[PDB]
Amino acid sequence: VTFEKSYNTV
Amino acid sequence: IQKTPQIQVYSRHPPENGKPNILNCYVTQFHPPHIEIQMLKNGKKIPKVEMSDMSFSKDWSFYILAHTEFTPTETDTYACRVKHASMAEPKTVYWDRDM
Amino acid sequence: GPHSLRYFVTAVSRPGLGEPRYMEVGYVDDTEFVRFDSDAENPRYEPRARWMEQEGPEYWERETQKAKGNEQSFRVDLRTLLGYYNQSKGGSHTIQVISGCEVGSDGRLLRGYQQYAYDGCDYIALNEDLKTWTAADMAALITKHKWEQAGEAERLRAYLEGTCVEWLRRYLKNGNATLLRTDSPKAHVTHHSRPEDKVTLRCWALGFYPADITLTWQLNGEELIQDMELVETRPAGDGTFQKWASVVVPLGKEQYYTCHVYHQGLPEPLTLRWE
Numbered sequence: 001v002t003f004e005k006s007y008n009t010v
Numbered sequence: 011i012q013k014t015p016q017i018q019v020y021s022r023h024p025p026e027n028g029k030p031n032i033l034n035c036y037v038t039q040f041h042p043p044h045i046e047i048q049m050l051k052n053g054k055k056i057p058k059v060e061m062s063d064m065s066f067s068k069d070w071s072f073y074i075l076a077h078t079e080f081t082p083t084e085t086d087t088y089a090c091r092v093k094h095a096s097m098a099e100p101k102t103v104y105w106d107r108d109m
Numbered sequence: 110g111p112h113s114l115r116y117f118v119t120a121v122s123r124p125g126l127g128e129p130r131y132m133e134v135g136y137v138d139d140t141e142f143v144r145f146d147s148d149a150e151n152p153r154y155e156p157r158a159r160w161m162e163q164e165g166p167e168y169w170e171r172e173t174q175k176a177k178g179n180e181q182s183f184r185v186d187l188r189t190l191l192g193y194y195n196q197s198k199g200g201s202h203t204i205q206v207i208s209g210c211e212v213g214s215d216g217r218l219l220r221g222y223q224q225y226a227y228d229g230c231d232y233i234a235l236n237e238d239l240k241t242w243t244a245a246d247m248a249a250l251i252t253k254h255k256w257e258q259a260g261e262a263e264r265l266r267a268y269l270e271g272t273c274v275e276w277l278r279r280y281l282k283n284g285n286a287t288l289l290r291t292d293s294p295k296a297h298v299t300h301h302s303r304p305e306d307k308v309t310l311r312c313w314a315l316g317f318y319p320a321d322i323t324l325t326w327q328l329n330g331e332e333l334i335q336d337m338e339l340v341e342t343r344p345a346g347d348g349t350f351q352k353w354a355s356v357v358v359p360l361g362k363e364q365y366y367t368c369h370v371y372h373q374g375l376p377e378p379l380t381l382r383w384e
Contacts, residue, residue, distance in 0.1 A: 001272055002133055002175050002176065002208070004175050004268070005182040005183065007178065007182050008261060010189055010190065010233070010255075016341070034344070034345075036343045041229045042229070043121055043203060063134075064132070066119065066205060070205050075344055075346055109340065
């Protein structure tokens with residue numbers, strides 16, 4: 001179960 | 011950025027002349043991850059060379075294991091040429107059966 | 110020791126040559142168990158350990174979806190960062206991320222982290238407290254200020270304290286059988302005659318797992334590492350590892366030199382002479 005970068009761009 | 015690859019070239023099993031074996035080219039400590047790794051037999055590209063999937067370590071540096079089936083002889087030479095952006099010329103490490 | 114669930118994520122831009130190459134690799138106690146690879150006929154999260162085949166299609170489909178979404182998010186980050194650093198679109202660049210929690214034997218969170226790196230350099234990192242951020246440079250301060258006043262510290266902490274921990278425990282129960290696997294090293298010594306009187310004794314160690322090992326050379330129960338030569342622990346490629354140490358010794362004194370092998374697989378360290 002991986003971290004969700006839920007469309008949070010840098 | 012731009013770390014230079016450390017290359018080892020070694021057999022899987024202790025090398026007996028005429029007995030089948032796997033030659034390993036273990037490339038590590040390199041960045042960026044774009045790299046070409048040819049395994050040579052008498053300065054010639056070996057066709058059937060299988061590469062592991064690419065990974066990276068705690069320090070961001072990438073590592074990978076190219077290998078190929080080979081039957082070591084008395085005469086035949088084996089090497090591993092590594093072209094990478096961090097080096098002017100490609101880097102060749104010749105197999106040494108005592109290492 | 111301390112158990113760990115870590116996710117290693119790489120997005121590498123290939124300007125002209127299609128979209129960026131994206132890849133996640135999951136690790137349980139430093140052993141690969143899942144991997145998503147954008148470059149593939151049909152990109153899916155796939156089991157890398159045999160024990161992860163217990164998980165059903167619901168697990169894989171959800172993880173794949175997460176990955177596909179992350180890929181598209183990182184695809185922006187690569188473009189976003191080209192702006193922050195006034196870089197060229199022609200140039201190829203690399204975003205890397207290490208996400209993970211580690212828990213004691215008690216099952217309790219010891220530490221959680223999220224580390225970013227752009228082109229090998231440290232970019233931005235989640236602190237020990239899982240509240241604040243640490244921006245390595247001025248470009249990283251833009252996204253610190255952004256993620257602060259977007260509540261990303263709260264969202265990550267919920268994963269690292271909650272999700273990451275709960276799932277590690279599950280993965281440890283499932284893979285315990287194969288994670289506790291240790292193959293103890295098979296070790297011999299080879300004689301190599303040199304031109305002069307000197308000769309090179311080489312202590313070999315083969316077929317051992319995991320990679321964590323120590324090789325030493327003793328004379329009068331005294332370890333000599335300064336005049337020793339040893340190679341980085343390398344994979345055999347069949348799942349086992351190799352490593353040798355070698356010392357140069359006066360000819361005829363090969364029996365006064367002893368090699369000692371330290372591995373968790375061995376009930377006690379292993380002693381060797383030239384036989």
